[PDB]
Amino acid sequence: ELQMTQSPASLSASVGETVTITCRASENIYSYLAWYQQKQGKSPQLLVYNAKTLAEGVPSRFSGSGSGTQFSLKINSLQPEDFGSYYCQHHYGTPLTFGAGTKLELKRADAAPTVSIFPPSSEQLTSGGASVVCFLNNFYPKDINVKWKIDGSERQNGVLNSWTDQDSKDSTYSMSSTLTLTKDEYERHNSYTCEATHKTSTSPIVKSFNRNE
């Protein structure tokens, strides 16, 4: 079939900065390429069709170019609203194939997390389970490691982790880390330790509590 290779997958940049997204067709598609923008949780929006014509409303800072097999989308002087994802698509003939997509994110300075640890809730305890939660809030970049420790021994089993999308106000990320045990296993120990390792420091930020306090 027809193949569209879009690059890159992810890209980061600052406001006022100019970036370029590339799209390659595996066959001469004359000039029948379109671009779309889609933000977290919204439906996609047409930006450019016929390879370089802007849709109505589309800011002038956006700019399509190319022919045959080589296409690119230039966004000049990025603005806050511009951050989100982009897709190319061949649009006059079947198959109307989409590129894989480019995610475009905002740059800011490295930022240490605000870490919080929470003990299993008594209500959860009556249900037979015990979840220890620990929030690592507003940090940059996205890469971070969390290590769980019970009476000072690492623990990997029963750890679920979840990261938010880029924050739209301050550009940080937030991760949530959950260690799940039963009320028994849990009741059988005292020290519960959340350790956060991040390029922002050499010492992991340790947060802890003692079950009997």
């Binding site: 079939e1 029948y32 379109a34 779309y36 889609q38 439906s43 996609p44 929006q45 047409l46 069709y49 016929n50 849709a55 897709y87 698509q89 649009h91 006059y92 079947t94 198959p95 109307l96 194939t97 989409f98 590129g99 894989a100 997509g101 605000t114 919080s116 929470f118 809730s121 209500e123 959860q124 249900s127 979840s131 939660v133 929030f135 809030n137 679920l160 982790n161 979840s162 990261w163 938010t164 937030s174 991760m175 949530s176 959950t178 799940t180």
Partner: protein, 213 residues
Amino acid sequence: QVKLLESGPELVKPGASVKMSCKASGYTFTSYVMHWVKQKPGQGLEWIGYINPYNDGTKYNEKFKGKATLTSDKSSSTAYMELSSLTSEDSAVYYCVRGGYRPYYAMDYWGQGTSVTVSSAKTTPPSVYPLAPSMVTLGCLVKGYFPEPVTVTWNSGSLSSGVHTFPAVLQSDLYTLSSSVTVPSSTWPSETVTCNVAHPASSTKVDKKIVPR
């Protein structure tokens, strides 16, 4: 205004089938083709095929041939897509999209999309457990619900700023998610803090007050 209106979310068992709808208004339904696009969570856009409402003609993406059937009803300005022998890999948001009218048909109008979860897992409400310890970070833990999504607020949107509501993770065929709220130390617990959790599939609304232990 041209407007496309899609059917509400679906929870189907594997091996079964689903049929979705797209009501079109604000233009001559028969004059523009109707495309269908698949998007799995966190993933790209994928073209399925399209129906021409005027002559009932269809063109499909090879891959969805004999997975998706497209139809339309002239009298009621309505477009339909049925998906058969449903597998987990069919769990995805599905869009209907109007086809341009040029010259070269650029996809211009997207509906809100229809979410389909293909699971044997069954509708289940969440348990909502509190998370208590110049700022304080409180939490709320939403455990063991199905399917997605759930909505969280704090104080019915009184507290909008300083909230992190993390993406759900599949915890043993059921979903788990958490939510954090940061507020001024002096305000709590004098001012009450409450997480309002809603799980529309189960028509359940939950309201935990965060009690200082």
